[PDB]
Design a protein around this nucleic acid. Structure first.
Ligand SMILES: [Mg+2]
Ligand SMILES: [Mg+2]
Ligand SMILES: [Mg+2]
Ligand SMILES: [Mg+2]
Ligand SMILES: [Mg+2]
Ligand SMILES: [Mg+2]
Ligand SMILES: [Mg+2]
Ligand SMILES: [Mg+2]
Ligand SMILES: [Mg+2]
Ligand SMILES: [Mg+2]
Ligand SMILES: [Mg+2]
Ligand SMILES: [Mg+2]
Ligand SMILES: [Mg+2]
Ligand SMILES: [Mg+2]
Ligand SMILES: [Mg+2]
Ligand SMILES: [Mg+2]
Ligand SMILES: [Mg+2]
Ligand SMILES: [Mg+2]
Ligand SMILES: [Mg+2]
Ligand SMILES: [Mg+2]
Ligand SMILES: [Mg+2]
Ligand SMILES: [Mg+2]
Ligand SMILES: [Mg+2]
Ligand SMILES: [Mg+2]
Ligand SMILES: [Mg+2]
Ligand SMILES: [Mg+2]
Ligand SMILES: [Mg+2]
Ligand SMILES: [Mg+2]
Ligand SMILES: [Mg+2]
Ligand SMILES: [Mg+2]
Ligand SMILES: [Mg+2]
Ligand SMILES: [Mg+2]
Ligand SMILES: [Mg+2]
Ligand SMILES: [Mg+2]
Ligand SMILES: [Mg+2]
Ligand SMILES: [Mg+2]
Ligand SMILES: [Mg+2]
Ligand SMILES: [Mg+2]
Ligand SMILES: [Mg+2]
Ligand SMILES: [Mg+2]
Ligand SMILES: [Mg+2]
Ligand SMILES: [Mg+2]
Ligand SMILES: [Mg+2]
Ligand SMILES: [Mg+2]
Ligand SMILES: [Mg+2]
Ligand SMILES: [Mg+2]
Ligand SMILES: [Mg+2]
Ligand SMILES: [Mg+2]
Ligand SMILES: [Mg+2]
Ligand SMILES: [Mg+2]
Ligand SMILES: [Mg+2]
Ligand SMILES: [Mg+2]
Ligand SMILES: [Mg+2]
Ligand SMILES: [Mg+2]
Ligand SMILES: [Mg+2]
Ligand SMILES: [Mg+2]
Lengths: 77, 100, 103, 46, 94, 58
RNA sequence: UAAGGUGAUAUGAACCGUUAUAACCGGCGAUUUCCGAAUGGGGAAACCCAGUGUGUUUCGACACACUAUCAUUAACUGAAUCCAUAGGUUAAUGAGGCGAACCGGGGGAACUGAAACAUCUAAGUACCCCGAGGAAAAGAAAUCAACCGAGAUUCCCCCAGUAGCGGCGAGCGAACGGGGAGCAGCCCAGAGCCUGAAUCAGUGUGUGUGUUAGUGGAAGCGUCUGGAAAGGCGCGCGAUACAGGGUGACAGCCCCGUACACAAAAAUGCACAUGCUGUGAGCUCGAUGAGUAGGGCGGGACACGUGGUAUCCUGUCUGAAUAUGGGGGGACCAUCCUCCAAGGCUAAAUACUCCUGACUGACCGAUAGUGAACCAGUACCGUGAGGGAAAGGCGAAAAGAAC
RNA sequence: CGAAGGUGUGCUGUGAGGCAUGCUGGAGGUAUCAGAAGUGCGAAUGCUGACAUAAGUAACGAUAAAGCGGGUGAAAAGCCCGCUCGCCGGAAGACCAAGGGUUCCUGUCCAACGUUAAUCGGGGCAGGGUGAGUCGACCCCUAAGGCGAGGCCGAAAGGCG
């Protein structure tokens, strides 16, 4: 699925309003990529389905902190 | 009336009437047309109206002497035949004993 | 706690055989007891050739209710209605009329 | 004619059988709607 | 080896028939109504050890019971195994 | 039951050994035309029941 | 606990048993083949085929135990390469499915009404799916209030169909504030203190009080009809028992129970007291939870819908001060009031009844009551999901008609 | 010493109606007064259950065909036996895999079943009847195709592999 493996984003629904305001359902898919990210405390790489915001998040905090929240959250790396 | 909303048969065609359900409220084992729910029945009467009713009932008992007044009336043992024989030799039949 | 038992001499209270006396033979806990020589009712046995049951009329006693009879105490010769008490660590039934402990 | 019911046991046990009702999660509800009204012929296995 | 609880519990009755008496009198054979869980390697090991009779072969089958209509009820009898068991030449059971 | 209620398992070995055979002889006479009594079967079945009860305890 | 029993259809048969191992009787341990989450693989479900180990072995076959899968821990052999990692191979603990209703998270529809229909209504209604429970969701101030104040949510009645929203059409619909049930506050974002200090019991005890069997428990006779007194007439009797049912028809005193007052060897609940498997109160110091509030873009929730719109949740893009500070007070500033998110927990007032015991009905008596008063989810009809009926009455006791 | 329900008979009001007794019937029911209604039937091609007419009338389901003597039986066109006649003979003869599940054989019964009669039966009851190293299923191996550890991808269901 869309397991945004940093911040946990999820496809939410909503509407498709017209300009007579006629409405139908839709989805809101999150931005993802598939990054082979580079960590220093093991001197190798790790696959990740990060989001668009998570790429900002990771270089703001650090990568070992993301490993620390991840392996205690339970979902793998 | 447990069944389902399916028709017995289609409407036009065979020479019968336009049936509608197996829960049909004019059929045998059908429904009830105006069935009633678990309800209440207590009305409301006023404070003034209730006390006026009490003042109205406290008058014909005086004018017909079915109310009588006695100061002391009791017994000193939990035994019912004592009140039975007390009412016997007091010579009353149907009494409403109101204590204080 | 059986107020009437299987081997006692019992009097019929009411019904067709009121006042009459006789012994009970055996007992059913559906509310019916065989009391001997009281209600002679007819029966027409069917003659089968097996086990030599030749048929003929049989006048047999009828069962009757426990709550239509009461014990026949010769200390009163009347209607005795059995009660209960405890002597020597066992339930012993006594007579609630004329106060005789059944022993 | 060639009528509607043409019987076959090895098709009936694979179409309307218990192990046909097994894997489909929408069919476990069907068995749970026959048990919870209590029919004798639960499925057409024999 | 086979244990005496099964060896004793496996037989159920000897059967009687106009068909049975012929195999009794011609071939020195017994006609046993046996329980359903009997095997040929075990019926022989029971009647050999217990009854002191020399036996070699068992020919099993299964009789199925009929449907009997009890008024407005219906019912069907039960599965019971038969066995035509031929004894060796020289034993007669009483 | 009060005889067996104290007894040892090495007695119960030979007792079961003869007991099942007595049940078998009893049932084969129930099959044949000698047994005309209808209680010894019910006796011997509960006889095996009462010792298979205690065989777990001892 | 007691003279009766071996269930009924539905009667015979050999029977046990009479002063207590006859059976119904409550609790405690042991028995529960195969199918089904089916778990050793497989399967058209009640069938088939095997392995390792401990067994004896009339060389002859049987007995028993073990073994799926992932969640998490330890080991041990550990690839591409030496260390590194995937990866297997065990061992331990945990998890699978099940069923009425209520709760709450992800989604999410129509005829209908507007007298047409598209904004809107029907409605976050039906239905799918997921979760934890006997409760759950919250919840203890970036609330509200007008410069007087109230002090968390929850939950009932009002203010009210009013001020709002609305092809200002159909309809949607609050709050402030008051009156009630109930009210308990708390610890994490620590370098040094008292040394096992309240606290919660998951626990050691027994008591009170149930609960799963029980026990006693009052008090009438003659007569008039009748096949039959329970009726009709007399004179009685018990009532901390006139609730009811039954016996040949309407009974307080013929049977059971009813008022009352006792009973448990085992096992257990709820309130209690006491060292317990682990508790750190209290006490000085402090720090005050960052890709976070906000802003732009399209929707959804707030009674707010081709708005002058506060506020909160987020898909995407940029995102600071940090207590001097930051928010809110129905656009917006200026002036004051009020309170500190980005880390959680918490009793009761609140809903429902497949299931257990009792009691009640200005509820209905076999076309009425659930669909089913009787072997009803059945015979039957449909290949399947699924739909689904007709049908009670002798008698006081069968004594059921010998011949 | 006879209640409801049914049944008839006089009698009475403006009407919905009311009154008692003859008969059957064998445990129940009601005054005046006020109180709650699942409260009144002919119609809805209305619903479920029973009974008429049409009418003892058309039909008795291949136009392959039967006749007579004997047995049994309360009476034989149909049953058993006997011998004249006929019909299929690539079927309507002799067997199995499908599918049904005692319909198979042996006694006994004629009430319903059988499109008639009925002793006969595929009908009712009861008893017997299905024997494998070699023949069919499991079994070793697959084809289409199903599931599918890990794996990949979807909101959960799950979708492929
Ligand atoms: Mg729309
Ligand atoms: Mg962070
Ligand atoms: Mg439909
Ligand atoms: Mg009906
Ligand atoms: Mg109804
Ligand atoms: Mg009586
Ligand atoms: Mg065979
Ligand atoms: Mg019995
Ligand atoms: Mg298995
Ligand atoms: Mg399996
Ligand atoms: Mg295999
Ligand atoms: Mg629509
Ligand atoms: Mg429309
Ligand atoms: Mg319209
Ligand atoms: Mg909570
Ligand atoms: Mg203040
Ligand atoms: Mg009593
Ligand atoms: Mg009692
Ligand atoms: Mg802070
Ligand atoms: Mg933001
Ligand atoms: Mg804004
Ligand atoms: Mg936007
Ligand atoms: Mg905000
Ligand atoms: Mg303002
Ligand atoms: Mg907080
Ligand atoms: Mg009905
Ligand atoms: Mg009737
Ligand atoms: Mg059918
Ligand atoms: Mg008369
Ligand atoms: Mg009448
Ligand atoms: Mg009348
Ligand atoms: Mg009567
Ligand atoms: Mg009567
Ligand atoms: Mg009555
Ligand atoms: Mg009519
Ligand atoms: Mg009309
Ligand atoms: Mg009509
Ligand atoms: Mg007609
Ligand atoms: Mg006619
Ligand atoms: Mg005519
Ligand atoms: Mg004609
Ligand atoms: Mg002739
Ligand atoms: Mg002819
Ligand atoms: Mg020819
Ligand atoms: Mg030809
Ligand atoms: Mg037949
Ligand atoms: Mg025959
Ligand atoms: Mg006929
Ligand atoms: Mg005939
Ligand atoms: Mg035949
Ligand atoms: Mg037949
Ligand atoms: Mg052979
Ligand atoms: Mg072969
Ligand atoms: Mg393939
Ligand atoms: Mg697959
Ligand atoms: Mg998988």
């Amino acid at each position: 699925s869309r397991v945004c493996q940093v911040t946990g984003k999820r496809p939410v629904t909503g509407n498709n309003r017209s300009h007579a305001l006629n409405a139908t359902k839709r989805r809101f898919l999150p931005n993802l990529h598939s990054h082979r990210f580079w960590v220093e405390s093991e001197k190798r790489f790790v696959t990740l389905r990060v989001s668009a915001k998570g790429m900002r998040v990771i270089d703001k905090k650090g990568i070992d902190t993301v490993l620390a929240e991840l392996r205690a959250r339970g979902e793998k790396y | 009336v447990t069944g389902s909303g399916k028709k017995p048969w289609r409407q036009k065609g065979t020479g019968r009437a336009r049936s509608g359900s197996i829960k049909s409220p004019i059929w045998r084992s059908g429904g009830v047309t105006f069935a009633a729910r678990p309800q209440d029945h207590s009305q409301k009467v006023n404070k003034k109206m209730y006390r006026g009713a009490l003042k109205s009932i406290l008058s014909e008992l005086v004018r017909q002497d079915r109310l009588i007044v006695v100061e002391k009336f009791s017994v000193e043992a939990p035994k019912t035949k004592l009140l039975a024989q007390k009412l016997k030799d007091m010579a009353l039949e149907d009494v409403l004993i109101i204590t204080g | 706690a059986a107020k009437i038992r299987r081997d006692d001499e019992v009097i019929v209270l009411t019904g067709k055989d009121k006042g009459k006396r006789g012994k009970v033979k055996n007992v059913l806990s559906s509310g019916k007891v065989i009391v001997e020589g009281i209600n002679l009712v007819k029966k027409h046995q069917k003659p089968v050739p097996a086990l030599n049951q030749p048929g003929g009329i049989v006048e047999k006693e009828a069962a009757i209710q426990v709550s239509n009879v009461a014990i026949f105490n010769a200390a009163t010769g009347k209607a005795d209605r059995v009660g209960f008490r405890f002597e020597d660590g066992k339930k012993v039934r006594f007579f609630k009329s004329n106060s005789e402990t059944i022993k | 004619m060639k009528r509607t019911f043409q019987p076959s046991v090895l098709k009936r046990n694979r179409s309307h059988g218990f192990r046909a009702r097994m894997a489909t999660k929408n069919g476990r509800q069907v068995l749970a709607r026959r048990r919870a009204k209590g029919r004798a012929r639960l499925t057409v296995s024999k | 080896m086979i244990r005496e609880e099964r060896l004793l519990k496996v037989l159920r009755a000897p059967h009687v028939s106009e068909k049975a008496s012929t195999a009794m009198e011609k071939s020195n054979t017994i006609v046993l109504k046996v329980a359903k869980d009997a095997t040929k390697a075990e019926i022989k090991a029971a009647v050999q050890k217990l009854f002191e009779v020399e036996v070699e072969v068992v020919n099993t089958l299964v009789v199925k019971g009929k449907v009997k209509r009890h008024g407005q009820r219906i019912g069907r009898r039960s599965d019971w195994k038969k066995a035509y068991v031929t004894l060796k030449e020289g034993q007669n059971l009483d | 039951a009060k005889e067996l209620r104290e007894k040892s398992v090495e007695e119960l070995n030979t007792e079961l050994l003869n007991l099942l055979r007595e049940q078998f002889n009893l049932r084969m006479q129930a099959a044949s035309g000698q047994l005309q009594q209808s209680h010894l079967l019910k006796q011997v079945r509960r006889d095996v029941a009462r010792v298979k009860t205690l065989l777990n305890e001892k």
